[PDB]
Design an enzyme around this catalytic site. Structure first.
Site, PDB file in Angstrom:
ATOM      1  N   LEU A   1     -22.350  10.001   1.859  1.00  0.00           N
ATOM      2  CA  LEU A   1     -22.214   8.659   1.493  1.00  0.00           C
ATOM      3  C   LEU A   1     -22.037   7.678   2.584  1.00  0.00           C
ATOM      4  CD1 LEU A   1     -20.251   9.133  -1.876  1.00  0.00           C
ATOM      5  CD2 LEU A   1     -22.725   8.903  -1.614  1.00  0.00           C
TER       6      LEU A   1
ATOM      7  N   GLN B   1     -19.793   6.638   6.453  1.00  0.00           N
ATOM      8  CA  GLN B   1     -18.604   6.852   7.095  1.00  0.00           C
ATOM      9  C   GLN B   1     -17.378   6.194   6.586  1.00  0.00           C
ATOM     10  OE1 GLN B   1     -17.014   8.172   9.811  1.00  0.00           O
ATOM     11  NE2 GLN B   1     -18.472   9.664   9.953  1.00  0.00           N
ATOM     12  N   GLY B   2     -16.497   6.867   6.357  1.00  0.00           N
ATOM     13  CA  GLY B   2     -15.128   6.294   6.077  1.00  0.00           C
ATOM     14  C   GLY B   2     -14.504   5.961   7.433  1.00  0.00           C
ATOM     15  N   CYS B   3     -12.976   5.494   7.362  1.00  0.00           N
ATOM     16  CA  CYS B   3     -12.439   5.071   8.458  1.00  0.00           C
ATOM     17  C   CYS B   3     -12.162   6.513   9.552  1.00  0.00           C
ATOM     18  CB  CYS B   3     -11.183   4.493   8.009  1.00  0.00           C
ATOM     19  SG  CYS B   3     -11.318   2.835   7.243  1.00  0.00           S
ATOM     20  N   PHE B   4     -12.089   7.317   9.081  1.00  0.00           N
ATOM     21  CA  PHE B   4     -11.434   8.675   9.787  1.00  0.00           C
ATOM     22  C   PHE B   4     -12.594   9.945   9.587  1.00  0.00           C
ATOM     23  CE2 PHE B   4      -7.677   5.970   8.335  1.00  0.00           C
ATOM     24  CZ  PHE B   4      -7.651   5.435   9.646  1.00  0.00           C
ATOM     25  N   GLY B   5     -13.642   9.715   8.930  1.00  0.00           N
ATOM     26  CA  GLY B   5     -14.336  10.971   8.632  1.00  0.00           C
ATOM     27  C   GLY B   5     -15.409  10.474   7.641  1.00  0.00           C
ATOM     28  N   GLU B   6     -16.319  11.641   7.503  1.00  0.00           N
ATOM     29  CA  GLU B   6     -17.528  11.553   6.555  1.00  0.00           C
ATOM     30  C   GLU B   6     -16.917  11.273   5.094  1.00  0.00           C
ATOM     31  OE1 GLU B   6     -19.493  14.549   7.979  1.00  0.00           O
ATOM     32  OE2 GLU B   6     -20.872  13.480   9.681  1.00  0.00           O
TER      33      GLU B   6
ATOM     34  N   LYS C   1     -13.661  12.425   0.203  1.00  0.00           N
ATOM     35  CA  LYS C   1     -13.196  12.054   1.814  1.00  0.00           C
ATOM     36  C   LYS C   1     -12.725  13.086   2.648  1.00  0.00           C
ATOM     37  CE  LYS C   1     -11.775   7.928   2.433  1.00  0.00           C
ATOM     38  NZ  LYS C   1     -11.056   6.281   2.427  1.00  0.00           N
TER      39      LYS C   1
ATOM     40  N   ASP D   1      -5.977  -4.312   3.255  1.00  0.00           N
ATOM     41  CA  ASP D   1      -7.530  -4.143   3.799  1.00  0.00           C
ATOM     42  C   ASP D   1      -8.579  -4.647   2.724  1.00  0.00           C
ATOM     43  OD1 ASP D   1      -9.260  -3.241   5.783  1.00  0.00           O
ATOM     44  OD2 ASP D   1      -8.574  -1.180   5.793  1.00  0.00           O
TER      45      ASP D   1
HETATM   46  C1  LIG Z   1     -19.949  -0.801   3.107  1.00  0.00           C
HETATM   47  C2  LIG Z   1     -20.147   0.407   3.739  1.00  0.00           C
HETATM   48  C3  LIG Z   1     -19.227   1.603   3.226  1.00  0.00           C
HETATM   49  O1  LIG Z   1     -18.313   1.784   3.818  1.00  0.00           O
HETATM   50  N1  LIG Z   1     -20.087   2.448   2.542  1.00  0.00           N
HETATM   51  C4  LIG Z   1     -19.690   3.624   2.000  1.00  0.00           C
HETATM   52  C5  LIG Z   1     -19.056   4.690   3.067  1.00  0.00           C
HETATM   53  C6  LIG Z   1     -18.594   5.775   2.509  1.00  0.00           C
HETATM   54  C7  LIG Z   1     -18.318   6.181   0.926  1.00  0.00           C
HETATM   55  C8  LIG Z   1     -18.955   5.304   0.317  1.00  0.00           C
HETATM   56  C9  LIG Z   1     -19.268   5.709  -1.126  1.00  0.00           C
HETATM   57  C10 LIG Z   1     -20.098   5.282  -1.992  1.00  0.00           C
HETATM   58  N2  LIG Z   1     -19.688   5.514  -3.106  1.00  0.00           N
HETATM   59  C11 LIG Z   1     -18.410   6.013  -3.293  1.00  0.00           C
HETATM   60  N3  LIG Z   1     -17.782   6.321  -4.423  1.00  0.00           N
HETATM   61  C12 LIG Z   1     -16.547   6.814  -4.208  1.00  0.00           C
HETATM   62  N4  LIG Z   1     -15.914   6.943  -2.893  1.00  0.00           N
HETATM   63  C13 LIG Z   1     -16.741   6.162  -1.768  1.00  0.00           C
HETATM   64  O2  LIG Z   1     -16.043   6.235  -0.616  1.00  0.00           O
HETATM   65  C14 LIG Z   1     -14.808   6.457  -0.597  1.00  0.00           C
HETATM   66  C15 LIG Z   1     -17.942   5.819  -2.029  1.00  0.00           C
HETATM   67  C16 LIG Z   1     -19.586   3.916   0.861  1.00  0.00           C
END
Ligand SMILES: */C=C/C(=O)Nc1cccc(-c2c[nH]c3ncnc(OC)c23)c1
EC number: 2.7.10.2
Length: 267
Positions: free
Chosen positions: A18, A20-25, A40, A131
């Site tokens: 989906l 990149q999070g702060c510390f992993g995909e 996460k 944040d």
């Molecule tokens: C604004 C860019 C961004 O941060 N996109 C993004 C990165 C990682 C995950 C997700 C995302 C998309 N749908 C999700 N549902 C629940 N959790 C997520 O990330 C925690 C989700 C978007």
């Protein structure tokens, strides 16, 4: 000794990245073979496993319809934090992209009202998020908006552009510093996701905001909504509105505050 949030890793499958999070995909996946989830993950070497798991620990205590909901945790490496799937991605990308091009003020104010409702809950629970910004709001079906990314959130006991100055400078993080961030988020909503303080670098933002500078009214934004932003940006954190007030103000906006609103070209 594990708690009742723990699941076995074999009950998860990871389909698709989906982002990149702060510390992993972060991955979209299924849980127990029938539930769509987001998962996460932690990239090796980024940070310690339990520092990563503090994010899960805060979400265990929070439960509200406008906060992304924790489902389960795998607290053994590789660690997974399993949560509610939001099908339309982060709000920042939504605003910048093809779909947000046709958003107008009623939809944008309704999104802000949902976010204010989630933060009103954070407020009532005596937490702070720290944040809050459009990149950390997630969008679902029917344009539901939910507060996400609790990596820095904490029970009450940094990018200067979104962070209240007293928090950026001295570390004084309160629900009123989140109210400041919500004011900046309102500018992201009314500019279709532009970076705040255009053409200013962080050091200039800091110097100017401390001198009293505030962003002006975005084009086609009603003055009453820019007034709300300026209240969220008061120097004295205790003079900023509560999220309870912001939620009510935004829910009632088009009856009580702008009963004469007329659509423009962009808002
Ligand atoms: C604004 C860019 C961004 O941060 N996109 C993004 C990165 C990682 C995950 C997700 C995302 C998309 N749908 C999700 N549902 C629940 N959790 C997520 O990330 C925690 C989700 C978007």
């Amino acid at each position: 000794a594990k708690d009742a949030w723990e699941i076995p890793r074999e009950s998860l499958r990871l389909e698709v990245k989906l982002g990149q999070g702060c510390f992993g995909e972060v991955w979209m996946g299924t849980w127990n073979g029938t539930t769509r989830v987001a998962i996460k993950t932690l990239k090796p070497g980024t940070m310690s496993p339990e520092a990563f798991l503090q994010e899960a620990q805060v979400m265990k205590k929070l439960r509200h319809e406008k906060l992304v909901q924790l489902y389960a945790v795998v607290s053994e490496e590789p660690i997974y934090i399993v949560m509610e799937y939001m099908s339309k991605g982060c709000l920042l990308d939504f605003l910048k992209g093809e779909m947000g091009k046709y958003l107008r003020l009623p939809q944008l104010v309704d999104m802000a009202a949902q976010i204010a409702s989630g933060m009103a809950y954070v407020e009532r629970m005596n937490y702070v998020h720290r944040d809050l910004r459009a990149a950390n709001i997630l969008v679902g079906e029917n344009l539901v908006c939910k507060v996400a990314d609790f990596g820095l959130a904490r029970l009450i006991e940094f990018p200067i552009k979104w962070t209240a100055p007293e928090a950026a400078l001295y570390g004084r993080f309160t629900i009123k510093s989140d109210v400041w961030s919500f004011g900046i988020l309102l500018t992201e909503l009314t500019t279709k996701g532009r970076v705040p303080y255009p053409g200013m670098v962080n050091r200039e933002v800091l110097d100017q905001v401390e001198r009293g500078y505030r962003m002006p009214c975005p084009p086609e934004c009603p003055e009453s909504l820019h007034d709300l932003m300026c209240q969220c940006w008061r120097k004295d954190p205790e003079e900023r509105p509560t999220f309870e007030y912001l939620q009510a103000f935004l829910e009632d906006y088009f009856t009580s505050t702008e009963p004469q609103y007329q659509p423009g070209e962009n808002l």
